[PDB]
Amino acid sequence: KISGGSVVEMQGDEMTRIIWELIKEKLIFPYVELDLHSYDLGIENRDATNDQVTKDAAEAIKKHNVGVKCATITPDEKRVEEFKLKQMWKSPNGTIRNILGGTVFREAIICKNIPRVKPIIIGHHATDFVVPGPGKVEITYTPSDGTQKVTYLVHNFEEGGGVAMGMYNQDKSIEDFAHSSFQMALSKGWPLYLSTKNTILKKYDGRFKDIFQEIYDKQYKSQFEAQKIWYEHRLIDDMVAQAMKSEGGFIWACSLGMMTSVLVCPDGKTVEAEAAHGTVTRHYRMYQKGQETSTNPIASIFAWTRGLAHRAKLDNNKELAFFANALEEVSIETIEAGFMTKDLAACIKGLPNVQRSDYLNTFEFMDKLGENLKIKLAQAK
Amino acid sequence: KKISGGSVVEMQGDEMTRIIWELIKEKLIFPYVELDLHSYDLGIENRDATNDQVTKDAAEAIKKHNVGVKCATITPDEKRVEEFKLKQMWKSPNGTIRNILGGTVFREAIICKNIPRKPIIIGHHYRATDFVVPGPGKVEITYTPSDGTQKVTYLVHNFEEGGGVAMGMYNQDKSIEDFAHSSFQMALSKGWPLYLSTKNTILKKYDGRFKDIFQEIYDKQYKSQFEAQKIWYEHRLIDDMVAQAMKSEGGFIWACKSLGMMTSVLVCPDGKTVEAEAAHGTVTRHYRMYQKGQETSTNPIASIFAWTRGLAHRAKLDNNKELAFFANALEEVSIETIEAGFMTKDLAACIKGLPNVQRSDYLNTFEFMDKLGENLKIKLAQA
Ligand SMILES: NC(=O)c1ccc[n+]([C@@H]2O[C@H](COP(=O)([O-])OP(=O)(O)OC[C@H]3O[C@@H](n4cnc5c(N)ncnc54)[C@H](OP(=O)(O)O)[C@@H]3O)[C@@H](O)[C@H]2O)c1
């Protein structure tokens, strides 16, 4: 078996919990041995430990660089009542993000037989108050050296009351955004585009464009030209214009079962992968009632494969990297071959025309991925 | 022999929308409706010659006669000033007319049963003071009452690490009240429910002000009439609102904090004044193809529906059931004509995919307008 390494695993809730254990059992463990740092982020254990499993998991990701997370219930009122929660805990994704930092990149997985060639990887990057009555709401900046004092008028209230707010943004955040954007662009080998309003908010987004150019020229221009890739700034409307008439395959800096979300830290060494969808509670209820479900596992599978690909990149693990690539291959090939779940069958033929004989249920699709994975790993090597 | 329309303010535009405009009137509106027409030529040449005075006059005429219908007008930039030898770079007519009439903009997409996906109407409530921070310092925001009361200073941020950027935003109470009013007026006009989505938790005081004002206006004015129509209002949050929206049959008005089918309507808070216009521009590419003598295929549905929304509002005001039925008949003739298979190149592309658009799949502009004239005559003959 392949020697994997140190990987932080986080288990989730409901249907994604089931698919998680299936993915490991039938796809991961039979071929890879891992120094696994498992953390049970189910809602009942998060309640029992008072989100301490969440904090611990986040710090463990900070130590071992690579994390793979399953979808976990985010509690609201009906959740607190359902599980008898001691408190309405904050989102574990929120906690982990507030401990690790970084920027989130969402990539959709494109099959050549599903209605939509190269995927677009989209990455996204305050004092409010009431104002009782008429008056002057100004915003003033005073440098630390006291050289000047600049005061702008947000609005002069003469009609009556209202509401106001002020926002800020330091340079280091924009520099981290550009860092992770260029690193992701070089890791995938696809060009990078930055889209902003830039004209409406003249001063605000122009800073983003400028910092992106400074970092690109002082660090990445050479390596980009050395990989048939580049960076370029555009505006939102023109970005949609060229986008709706392009082959695809670029990092744009601004069925759900196929969306993959990955948090990339600015230092470039720490990465957390997770499906972009939720716990699929409706299908989990169908599973509780003994009915037949059909949940696409591709998003969580790709969380595992991207996490393993990053672990392999860190450990110089050629075998494990080949394994992750092989599993992604088996997935896209299995769907393109015709075997898929009901959601993809609906994306193709439209819901009211979906016959049963057009899709497989969750366990059948997992079995098919297992067969094709064993075949692929035996023949491709 | 023709329907008595009423007082309507017309605004003429530029280029391809100008051509399609004259086609819509000549072949669809005038043969069946007589109007006390307040025409205003908002073309770039007349706006230049009169020094944008025709824009102010047209806006004031809409404020007086309640119903306005506008054609797409060029908003001039540098290449426009260079093209027309403009004396000045005039402001956007939508900007002027909107700053004189107030109100809230509602955009509705027209859904055909053969178009890649009940319609959803989205009304939107810009002036933000942003600046760059060069180095360390204190960025504060201060409110000072008019009655000489103590001034309250909040710290937006203290920069000690280095530079950055900052900005400030505001919103008066009257603006939020106009937004909620126009939202309720549109909700009762369409008979669909109304939803308000905000970041009520992150911006507690800011969006909480919106939620509160919306609820207060709902209770001390409406709610009774909503219950009198099997409809309601409800505040929600962004993500759950997208959840309910993206998984419903459609048919609700969402208040937020293909272009040939998009219709834009400015609704004033008073509920009487309404200005309708297509959500697209003057279609310069098609107008240049039209100048060179080439064959164009520009969808007129958006402008036609501008006319039908304006006329339907005029009929609703004057209690003109005949004119209201005419507007409904024209809307239905449009959607039915497209669903019958006759359409323009953009819709043919939405159906058959762009690289596979064969000519025999669409009609040119004049052919499609002729078809709408035929089907309008037939339907109005059957009624
Ligand atoms: N990191 C996390 O733990 C995390 C992040 C996101 C969401 N969530 C949690 O998920 C819970 C419920 O989420 P939700 O109600 O919004 O549903 P969801 O999981 O976000 O997805 C909603 C829809 O996705 C569809 N779906 C079908 N197959 C799927 C597949 N293989 N993968 C993903 N989605 C599939 C279902 O459509 P059908 O109607 O046809 O069944 C379902 O209605 C929430 O408590 C939320 O906190 C967890």
Ligand SMILES: NC(=O)c1ccc[n+]([C@@H]2O[C@H](COP(=O)([O-])OP(=O)(O)OC[C@H]3O[C@@H](n4cnc5c(N)ncnc54)[C@H](OP(=O)(O)O)[C@@H]3O)[C@@H](O)[C@H]2O)c1
């Ligand atoms: N913001 C506005 O919409 C607005 C408001 C009032 C007046 N105007 C004025 O109208 C004038 C003409 O500008 P405009 O052509 O942009 O008006 P427009 O009405 O917004 O034009 C839309 C057109 O853009 C074209 N297009 C070309 N490539 C595209 C792509 N990759 N993605 C999406 N659409 C694409 C389409 O025509 P094809 O079928 O040929 O591709 C489409 O009909 C301007 O001077 C403007 O000031 C515009």
Ligand SMILES: CN1C(=O)/C(=C/c2ccc(=O)n(Cc3ccccc3)c2)NC1=S
């Ligand atoms: C899908 N998804 C997110 O993208 C996410 C991130 C996030 C980060 C911070 C935060 O405050 N929230 C909102 C929240 C507040 C309190 C309790 C629970 C959630 C959410 N949480 C989830 S579920």
Ligand SMILES: CN1C(=O)/C(=C/c2ccc(=O)n(Cc3ccccc3)c2)NC1=S
């Ligand atoms: C497409 N499109 C609009 O939808 C639009 C609306 C609008 C409404 C209010 C307003 O104050 N402005 C500001 C403005 C003033 C002068 C020139 C340009 C913009 C613009 N202006 C345009 S061009």
